[PDB]
Design a protein around this nucleic acid. Structure first.
Length: 137
RNA sequence: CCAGCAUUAUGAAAGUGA
RNA sequence: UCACUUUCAUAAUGCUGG
């Protein structure tokens, strides 16, 4: 329902610009503008985040209402292609502020694999690649 | 700033049907 | 060429924890 979500669904990669910040520090007023379809809209909001919603709203009103495998593919597809339904499992997660390492584990019916990464998605992929490289090719 | 869960849009790969 | 299901990558939004 949000303007920022919708508007960006329809106008990907769009540049919002801050043109002014007025008012006292404890009660700031931000104003953003954007050009779309040749029209420039300007809206203001209490913060930078919202000022944008307010503009995107105004726009919508006008309109109507990476790690890879030799096969050159991500492993987590390949994995699911060969053993459809494999389950992955978070084995370690460390930190909670800046650096965070995750260590997942996928066992192939009989063989198991593990991989660490900064994102869970990444730690998971590495665990796949390893299992794949090691068993299939 | 880092991370997690969820929804929506675009892209790719695998299977089924016409 | 169209529809449905699974997986992944990118983006956006919402909330939570740090």
């Amino acid at each position: 329902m949000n303007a920022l979500m919708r508007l960006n669904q329809l106008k990907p990669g769009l540049q919002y610009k801050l043109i002014s910040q007025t008012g006292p520090v404890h009660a700031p007023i931000f104003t953003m503008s954007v050009e779309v379809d040749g029209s420039n809209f300007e809206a203001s909001g209490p913060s930078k985040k919202t000022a944008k919603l307010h503009v995107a709203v105004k726009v919508l009103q006008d309109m109507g209402l990476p790690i890879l495998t030799k096969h050159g593919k991500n492993p987590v597809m390949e994995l699911n292609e060969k053993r459809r339904g494999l389950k992955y499992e978070l084995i370690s997660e460390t930190g909670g502020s800046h650096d965070k390492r995750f260590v997942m584990e996928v066992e192939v019916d009989g063989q198991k694999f593990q991989g660490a990464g900064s994102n869970k998605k990444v730690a998971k992929a590495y665990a796949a690649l390893a299992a794949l490289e090691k068993l299939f090719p």
